[PDB]
């Protein structure tokens, strides 16, 4: 029902676009912020079993974050059909997550 933990060495353009679902939120150590996503991507995961939610530390691997769009707030990424299908900076509840994801 959740996976959420650093995926670096799965995370990669070169398997990520051989995927078919992933979902990678992206976070900092010194982020007040950061938390929510983390009790409602937990909440979304338990009414989402098929699709896996993982972190990245951007801290660990800010070309990462860049190349993939982004260097701002925390951050969530999804991967579908093997390419990403949205990159959303900021806060959300597991109720918009699920309405988010099945719009993808």
Known sequence: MSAIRDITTEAGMAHFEGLSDAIVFFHKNLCPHCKNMEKVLDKFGARAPQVAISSV????????????????????????????????????????????????
């Open 57 to 104: 530390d951007s801290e660990a691997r800010p070309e990462l974050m860049k190349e993939l769009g982004f260097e701002r707030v925390p951050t969530l990424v999804f991967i579908r059909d093997g390419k990403v299908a949205k990159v959303f900076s900021g806060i959300m509840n597991p109720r918009e997550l699920q309405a988010l994801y099945a719009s993808i």
